[PDB]
mmCIF file with all atom_site columns, C-alpha atoms in Angstrom:
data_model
loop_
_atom_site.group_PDB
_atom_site.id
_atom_site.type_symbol
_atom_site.label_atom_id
_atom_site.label_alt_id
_atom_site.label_comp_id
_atom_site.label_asym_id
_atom_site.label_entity_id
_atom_site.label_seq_id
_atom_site.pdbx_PDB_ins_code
_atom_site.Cartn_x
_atom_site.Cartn_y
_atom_site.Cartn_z
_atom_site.occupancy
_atom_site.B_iso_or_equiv
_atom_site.pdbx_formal_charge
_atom_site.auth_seq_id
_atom_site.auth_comp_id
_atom_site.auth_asym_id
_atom_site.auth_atom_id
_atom_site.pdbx_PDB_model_num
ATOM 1  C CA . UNK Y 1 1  ? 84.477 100.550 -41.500 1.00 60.73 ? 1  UNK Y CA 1
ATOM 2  C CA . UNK Y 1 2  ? 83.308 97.161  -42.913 1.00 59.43 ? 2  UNK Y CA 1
ATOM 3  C CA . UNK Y 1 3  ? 83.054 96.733  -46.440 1.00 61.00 ? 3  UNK Y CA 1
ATOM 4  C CA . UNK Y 1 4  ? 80.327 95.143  -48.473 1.00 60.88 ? 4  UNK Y CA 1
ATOM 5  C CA . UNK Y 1 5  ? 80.289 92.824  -51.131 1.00 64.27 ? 5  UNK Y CA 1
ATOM 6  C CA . UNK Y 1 6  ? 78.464 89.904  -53.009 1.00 66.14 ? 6  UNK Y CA 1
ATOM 7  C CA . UNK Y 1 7  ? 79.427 86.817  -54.299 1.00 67.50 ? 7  UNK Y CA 1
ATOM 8  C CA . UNK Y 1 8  ? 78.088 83.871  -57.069 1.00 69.10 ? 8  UNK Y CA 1
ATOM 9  C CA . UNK Y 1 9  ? 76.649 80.684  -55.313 1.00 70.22 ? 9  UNK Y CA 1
ATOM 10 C CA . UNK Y 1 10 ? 76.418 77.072  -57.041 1.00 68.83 ? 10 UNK Y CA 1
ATOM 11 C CA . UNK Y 1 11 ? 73.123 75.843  -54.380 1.00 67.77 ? 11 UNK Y CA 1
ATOM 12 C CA . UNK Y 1 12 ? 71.849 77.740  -51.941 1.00 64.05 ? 12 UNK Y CA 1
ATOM 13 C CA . UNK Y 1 13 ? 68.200 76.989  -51.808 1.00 67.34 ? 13 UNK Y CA 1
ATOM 14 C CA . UNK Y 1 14 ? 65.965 79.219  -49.263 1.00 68.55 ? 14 UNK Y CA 1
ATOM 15 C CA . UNK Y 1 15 ? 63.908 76.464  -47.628 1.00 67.78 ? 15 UNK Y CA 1
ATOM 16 C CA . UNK Y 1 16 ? 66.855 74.768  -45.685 1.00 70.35 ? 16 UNK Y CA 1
ATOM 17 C CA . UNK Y 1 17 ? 69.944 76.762  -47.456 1.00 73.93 ? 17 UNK Y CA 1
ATOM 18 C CA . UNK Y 1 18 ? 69.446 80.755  -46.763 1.00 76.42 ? 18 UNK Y CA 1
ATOM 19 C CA . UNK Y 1 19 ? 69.503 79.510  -43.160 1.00 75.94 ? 19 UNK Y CA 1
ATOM 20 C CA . UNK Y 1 20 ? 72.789 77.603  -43.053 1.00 79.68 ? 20 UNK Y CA 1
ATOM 21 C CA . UNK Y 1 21 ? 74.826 80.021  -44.295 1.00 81.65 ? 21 UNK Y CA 1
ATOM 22 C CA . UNK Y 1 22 ? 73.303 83.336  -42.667 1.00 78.94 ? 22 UNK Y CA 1
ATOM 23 C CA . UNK Y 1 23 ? 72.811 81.832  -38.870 1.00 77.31 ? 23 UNK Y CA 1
ATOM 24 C CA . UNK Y 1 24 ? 76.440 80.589  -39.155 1.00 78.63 ? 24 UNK Y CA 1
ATOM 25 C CA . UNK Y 1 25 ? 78.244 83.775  -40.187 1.00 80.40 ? 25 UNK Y CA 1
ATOM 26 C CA . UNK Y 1 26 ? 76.979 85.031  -36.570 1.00 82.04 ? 26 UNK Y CA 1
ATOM 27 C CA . UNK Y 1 27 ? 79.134 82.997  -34.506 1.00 81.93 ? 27 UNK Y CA 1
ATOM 28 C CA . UNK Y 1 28 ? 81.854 83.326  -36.989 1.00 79.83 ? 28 UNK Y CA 1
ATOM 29 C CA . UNK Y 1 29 ? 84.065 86.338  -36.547 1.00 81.58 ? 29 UNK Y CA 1
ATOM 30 C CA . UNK Y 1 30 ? 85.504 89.006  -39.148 1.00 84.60 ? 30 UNK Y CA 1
ATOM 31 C CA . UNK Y 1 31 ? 81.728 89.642  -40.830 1.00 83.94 ? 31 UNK Y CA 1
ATOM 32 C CA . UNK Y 1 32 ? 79.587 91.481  -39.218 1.00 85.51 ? 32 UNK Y CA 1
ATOM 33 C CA . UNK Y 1 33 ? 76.337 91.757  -41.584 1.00 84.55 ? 33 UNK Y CA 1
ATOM 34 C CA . UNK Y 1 34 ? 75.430 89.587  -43.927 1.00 85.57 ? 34 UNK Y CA 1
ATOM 35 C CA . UNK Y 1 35 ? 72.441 88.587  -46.532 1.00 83.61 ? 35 UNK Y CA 1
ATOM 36 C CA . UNK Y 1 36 ? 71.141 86.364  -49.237 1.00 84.24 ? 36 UNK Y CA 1
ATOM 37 C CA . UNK Y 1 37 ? 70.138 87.275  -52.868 1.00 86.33 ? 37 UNK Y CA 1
ATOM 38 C CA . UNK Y 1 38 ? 69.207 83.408  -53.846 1.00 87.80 ? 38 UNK Y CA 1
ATOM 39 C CA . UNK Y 1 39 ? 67.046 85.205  -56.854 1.00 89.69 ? 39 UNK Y CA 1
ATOM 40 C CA . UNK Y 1 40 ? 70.417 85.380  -58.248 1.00 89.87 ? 40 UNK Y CA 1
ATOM 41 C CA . UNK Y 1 41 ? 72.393 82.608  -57.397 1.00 85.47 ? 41 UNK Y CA 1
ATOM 42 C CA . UNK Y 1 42 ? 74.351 85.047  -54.569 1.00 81.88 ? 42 UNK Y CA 1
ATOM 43 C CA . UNK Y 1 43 ? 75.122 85.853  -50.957 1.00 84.78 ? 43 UNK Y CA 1
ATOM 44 C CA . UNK Y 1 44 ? 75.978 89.439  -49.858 1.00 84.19 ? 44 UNK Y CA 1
ATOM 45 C CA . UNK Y 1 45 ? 78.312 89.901  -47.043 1.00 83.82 ? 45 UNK Y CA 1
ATOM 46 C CA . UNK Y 1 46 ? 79.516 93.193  -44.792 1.00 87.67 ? 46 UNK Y CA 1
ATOM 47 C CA . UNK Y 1 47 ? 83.149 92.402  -43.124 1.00 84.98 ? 47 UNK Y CA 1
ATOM 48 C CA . UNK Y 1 48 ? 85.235 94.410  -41.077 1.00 83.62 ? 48 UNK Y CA 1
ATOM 49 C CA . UNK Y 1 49 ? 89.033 93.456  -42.630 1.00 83.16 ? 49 UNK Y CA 1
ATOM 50 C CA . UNK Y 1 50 ? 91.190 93.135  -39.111 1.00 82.71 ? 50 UNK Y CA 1
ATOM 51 C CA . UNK Y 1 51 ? 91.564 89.379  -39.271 1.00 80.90 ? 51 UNK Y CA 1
ATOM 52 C CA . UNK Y 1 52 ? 89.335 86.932  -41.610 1.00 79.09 ? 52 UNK Y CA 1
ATOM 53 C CA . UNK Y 1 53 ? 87.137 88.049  -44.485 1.00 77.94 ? 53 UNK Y CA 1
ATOM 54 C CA . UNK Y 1 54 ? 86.049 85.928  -47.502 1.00 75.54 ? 54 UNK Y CA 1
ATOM 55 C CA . UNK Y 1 55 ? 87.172 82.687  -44.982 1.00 73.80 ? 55 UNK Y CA 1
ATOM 56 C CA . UNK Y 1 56 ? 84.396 83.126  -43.233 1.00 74.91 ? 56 UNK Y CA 1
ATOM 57 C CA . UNK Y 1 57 ? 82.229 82.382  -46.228 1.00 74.24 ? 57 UNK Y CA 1
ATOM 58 C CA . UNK Y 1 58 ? 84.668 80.227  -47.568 1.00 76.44 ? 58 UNK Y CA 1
ATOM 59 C CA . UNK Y 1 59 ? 84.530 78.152  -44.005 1.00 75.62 ? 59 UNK Y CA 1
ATOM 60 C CA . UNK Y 1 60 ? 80.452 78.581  -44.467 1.00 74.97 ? 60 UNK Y CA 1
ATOM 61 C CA . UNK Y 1 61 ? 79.684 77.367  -48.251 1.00 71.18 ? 61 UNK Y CA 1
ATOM 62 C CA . UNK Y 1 62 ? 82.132 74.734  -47.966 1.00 70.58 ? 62 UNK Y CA 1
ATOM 63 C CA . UNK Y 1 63 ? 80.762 73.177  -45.019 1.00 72.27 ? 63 UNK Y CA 1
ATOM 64 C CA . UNK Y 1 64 ? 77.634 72.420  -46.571 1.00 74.11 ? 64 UNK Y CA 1
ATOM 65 C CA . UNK Y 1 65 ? 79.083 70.751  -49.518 1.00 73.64 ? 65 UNK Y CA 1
ATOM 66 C CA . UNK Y 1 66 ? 78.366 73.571  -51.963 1.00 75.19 ? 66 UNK Y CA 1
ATOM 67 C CA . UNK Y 1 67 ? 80.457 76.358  -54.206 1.00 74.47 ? 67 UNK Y CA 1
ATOM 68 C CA . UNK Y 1 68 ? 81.348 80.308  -54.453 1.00 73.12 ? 68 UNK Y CA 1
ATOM 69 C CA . UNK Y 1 69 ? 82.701 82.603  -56.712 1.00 77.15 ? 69 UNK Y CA 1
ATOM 70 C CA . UNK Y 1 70 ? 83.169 85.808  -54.356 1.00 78.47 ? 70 UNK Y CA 1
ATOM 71 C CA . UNK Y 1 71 ? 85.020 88.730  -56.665 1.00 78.18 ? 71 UNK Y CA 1
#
């Protein structure tokens, strides 16, 4: 009922990066599961489409100061 997907990251480190994207997505609404793939350069996502989606990562990578390329 929620869809996954991955997108590209510009700089999310594990040591204090993994974190402050995944234990935000939580207490955001709209996703629902969520992980990182930082062997790539990407962060994988499971949202349920009723009201925000990629926002919720959008919301997430921006406020750290970094960038995404979600397809």
């Amino acid at each position: 009922p929620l869809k996954t997907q991955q997108m590209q990251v510009g700089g999310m480190d594990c040591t204090s990066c993994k974190l402050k994207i995944e234990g935000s997505l939580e207490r955001l609404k709209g996703v629902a599961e969520a992980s990182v793939t930082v062997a790539t350069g990407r962060l994988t996502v499971t949202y349920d489409p009723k009201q925000v989606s990629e926002i919720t990562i959008q919301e997430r990578i921006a406020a750290l100061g970094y960038t995404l390329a979600e397809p």
